[PDB]
């Protein structure tokens, strides 16, 4: 008989309407569970991770830590291969958090037969970390707590910067590009745009994007593939970030085309050790940030020392 007030979510597939204070929270895709956990809520189910951790564990250190602290269990969807609708349904969720995600219209329609879905605003994988919090927390009926979580996460970042005066000054205003450069094939590579949370996080640390990036912001993607032939377009970058290994930088500087790029020949390159918790953290969540920001700043400060 009682009709509690509704939460109405605007997103890429229209609207989601649910009753205030949903109890059982499922999440899907990268990082959304870290929002629930940061807000003190243990999901009845969330997506398995296999980047920066083994599929066997399927959970990152900061996530595992927060769960244990909340005296909870980790209920993982066996969904590395794709959404596991059966597993999601069996968790009997009152809501499904997908604020940062790549779901299609068909995914959305099917998930919605299980529970109300908090989808991304516009485009797949184009949700910045603050907006992930805004979307997911509003779905929980916890907008206010979400804003407070954003403010505390911003404070965490600011605190760590203040503790490293040299690094803070050294990276401030450096023009940076987050990329994916495969040393085993340099004919083409990827540049993440400002719409990608991992590129955008860098601006939270005081870095900026070079003007060259704007050429690639027009396409509706979180990343653009460009040929080595175009590599000279980004000679205005002070520093470049890429995933890789201890062989990556050497290989790049020796490359006939990539080796002529200013930041690369300068050694102004932060190589994130691939498939590590640190690599995972570069797509930030409120939990990952606290856990890794010191290590990340040191890596960034060190690459920026080489900028000329």
Author numbering: 34 to 341
What does the paper say about this structure?
In the structure of PiaA-B3P, a molecule of B3P with two conformations binds to a cleft of PiaA. Superposition of apo-PiaA and PiaA-B3P against the ferrichrome-complexed form gives an RMSD of 0.31 Å for 262 Cα atoms and 0.45 Å for 283 Cα atoms, respectively.
To obtain sufficient iron, S. pneumoniae evolved two major highly conserved iron ABC transporters, which are termed Piu (for pneumococcal iron uptake) and Pia (for pneumococcal iron acquisition) systems, respectively. The N- and C-terminal domains face each other to form a hydrophobic and plastic cleft.
